[PDB]
Structures are given as structure tokens and as C-alpha cells.
Amino acid sequence: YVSPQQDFSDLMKSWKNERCSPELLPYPHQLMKRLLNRISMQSQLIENISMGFLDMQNASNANPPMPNESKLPLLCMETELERLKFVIRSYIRCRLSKIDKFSLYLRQLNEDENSLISLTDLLSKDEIKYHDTHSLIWLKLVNDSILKYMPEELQAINDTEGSVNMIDEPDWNKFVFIHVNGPPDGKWNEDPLLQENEFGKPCYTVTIPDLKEEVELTIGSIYVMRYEVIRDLLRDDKVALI
């Protein structure tokens, strides 16, 4: 770590994985904190130079900031901050929409005792407040509008035993485009999953049980593949959603 370029690379890869994935990916808690702190300090910095340039100007009708080696640096600061803010905004709003889509599923996950998935890790605190408030508001709306005139036998908005399941869950077999990066950093011999093939670079192997077949993914090729069989590789950065 301790590299501002890698923070931006990680944010971009997280955003790209977020847009194309069906599920609700875990929240990178530390990266967001570091980026927000960096933005907070940087905005203060540009404000400081702006104030310093403004105050001296009015004092004794001095010349403005001399144009050479002056305007372009500060303009670059502003535009860079603008781009970074846009990227984070798009990431946050996309994940908020995905939270909206899967409210009942997340509630059922949180209510289950024997579930390793917990909302304290998968959901940010502000996202927790959003989920709780939106669920209550929607429940109030539906209860006031429709559900009050219904028999006590069926008055639940979540019914897993009815004719049609009322709790929607993510599609675990959606087809996605992936690119095979290989090892996240290097040391191709270190990775145990890598296995060499004939007259070619080492390729990963996966199995499709419903089809009952073995599929080999060669490094440097783009594939259209099921999402479930590639979850571990994406979690370990071996593959990247395009």
C-alpha cells in the first residue's frame, strides 16, 4: 500500500466489478475511508492556495498570479477531484439501487442465526440506515394501501410457503464477460490453482456440475461464462469482469 495510484486502481476495479455483477459485493471499508480522507485534505489544500492568492491581491493592488506555471496545476487539481467524486458517486448510487432490489433477502440473511454472511460486513453503516428506513416506509405504504383488507392467514409481505415465493434472490447463473488476468501480482509457480497445458500458457480449470463438464480458461482470453463457477476467482482477483 502507501501508493495513491493503487487506491485509484482498486476503486476502479471495484466499480467495474460492481456494475456487472448480479450479487451485492462486500464493501471495501478501508479503501473508501482512505479516499474520503484524501479528498477532504485535498479540497482544503486547493481552498488554502485560493485564499492565499486572493488575500494578497486586494491588499496593495498587486498583480494577479503570474500566468506561467500558475493556472494549469490548480486547474488539474480541480478536474482530478471532479473525476474522482464522479466515480465514487456512481459506485455508491449503483450499490444503493442493488440494495433496494434485495431488501427482503438481506433481511432474511440478517435474521438467520447459522449464516456466515452478516450485514455488518456486507453493508456500510449509512447503507444500514438506508435499508432500515426504506423498509419501514415501504411497509407502512403497503399496509395502509392494500394489506389491511386481507385475511390474517395471508398478511405477510414475505411468504416462502405460498404459491409463489415472495422473496427474490440474486441470479447465481447469470452470464457475464470476464478477462483472465492470472495471478494478482505474480509468482506463477506459487499459485497452486495454475496448471500448465499443451504448448500454451497455464490455464485455470473450473467445473460445471449441471452440465457436468470441465472448462479451461487460458490466460489472456475473454470468456462469456456463468457467474457461480467463477465466484472464487473473482474474489481472489484472478479474473476481472469486463
Binding site: 439501487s97 452470464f175 470468456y223 462469456v224
Partner: protein, 189 residues
């Protein structure tokens, strides 16, 4: 995010953003070497930008290069693949092998359009010839994509060297067709 589709596919402008987030080479027309205000960037390394000398080759990110060429303080050198010779080699490779895609960079269309729009003077070859060659390549790639679309199934596909824009313009059709085929197959089990 939510409005105007955007749920599961990128817009062309976002693809352009990703393309402009990539390095490029330039010839500075100004000297900002430290004496014997500074850039201090937070998402890109500023070592090259701080240490600049005129009439020497350096590399920076693309959008800074466009911002500099908006003024008169830069001159972007087009990549070596943007030449008539290197394009004619790829056209021949494309003709000879009718079952594989040629090895072009994953941003060739977007980079070509951006460079033709912004840095028109920097090219050495006449620009109309290159513009014709790009269309000549695109048509053949479209023919190969049309032939390859026939082999759709429920298991997996491989598109080894397809470009980013070509993948983006074809994703919604391909994904949905294979999804429907997969549901039909799964139902019968």
C-alpha cells in the same frame, strides 16, 4: 446508475472515460524543471509532470495531454499502430485467418476517434487514408462477429481478442439469449 437503463451495461461515455484513464506519450513545448506551485496529484504520479524539459519525450495520462493540447503547450505522438503500414499488415492478417481476431489494442476505435478529433495536426500520414483503413478493418471484424454468432449455446463462449466497444455493443443480446437458453435447458432436468 438507475435512470436511462445503466443497470448492467456501460454507456459509450463511460467507455471513453476508461480509455482516457490510460497513459500516452507527448513532446512538451514548455520547461517546468525545478530551479537549482507544483502539481501534487492524488490519482496519478506527478513525477514526470513536475520534471519537464522542452523537446524531450515523456509520458502522462491521456486527459492531461488533451487539456495541455487545448492550450499550445503539448504535442501528442500517436501510437505506432496508427500507421498505414501497420494497419495494412493487420488487414492482411485479418484476411488470411478467417477464424481468429487480429491482435489490436483494446481501445483502438476510441483512441482513433479521440486522436482524429483532437490532435489532427500531429499525424504524419494523411488522415483520410487512416480513416479509410479503420473502416476497412471494422467491416471485416463485423463479418467475423456475424459468422461467430451462430455458435451460441448454454455452456460458455470464447471471444479472445474482441475490442471493448465491440463487446459493449453486443453484450445485451448475447447475455440474454444465452440466459434464456440456459433456463430452457435447466427446466428439462
Amino acid at each position: 446508475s438507475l435512470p436511462a437503463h445503466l443497470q448492467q451495461t456501460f454507456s459509450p461515455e463511460e467507455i471513453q472515460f476508461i480509455v482516457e484513464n490510460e497513459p500516452i506519450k507527448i513532446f512538451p513545448r514548455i520547461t517546468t524543471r525545478q530551479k537549482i506551485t507544483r502539481w501534487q496529484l492524488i490519482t496519478t504520479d506527478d513525477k514526470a509532470l513536475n520534471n519537464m524539459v522542452a523537446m524531450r519525450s515523456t509520458e502522462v495520462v491521456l486527459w492531461i495531454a488533451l487539456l495541455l493540447k487545448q492550450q499550445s503547450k503539448c504535442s501528442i505522438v500517436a501510437p505506432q499502430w496508427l500507421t498505414t503500414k501497420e494497419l495494412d499488415r493487420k488487414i492482411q492478417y485479418e484476411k488470411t485467418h478467417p477464424d481468429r481476431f487480429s491482435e489490436l489494442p483494446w481501445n483502438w476505435l476510441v483512441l482513433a476517434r479521440i486522436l482524429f478529433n483532437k490532435a489532427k495536426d500531429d499525424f504524419h500520414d494523411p488522415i483520410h487514408e487512416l480513416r479509410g483503413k479503420i473502416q476497412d478493418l471494422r467491416e471485416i471484424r463485423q463479418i467475423k462477429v456475424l459468422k461467430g454468432l451462430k455458435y451460441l449455446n448454454e455452456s460458455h463462449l470464447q471471444l479472445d481478442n474482441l475490442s471493448l466497444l465491440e463487446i459493449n455493443e453486443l453484450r445485451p443480446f448475447i447475455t440474454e439469449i444465452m440466459d434464456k437458453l440456459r433456463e430452457i435447458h435447466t427446466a428439462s432436468l
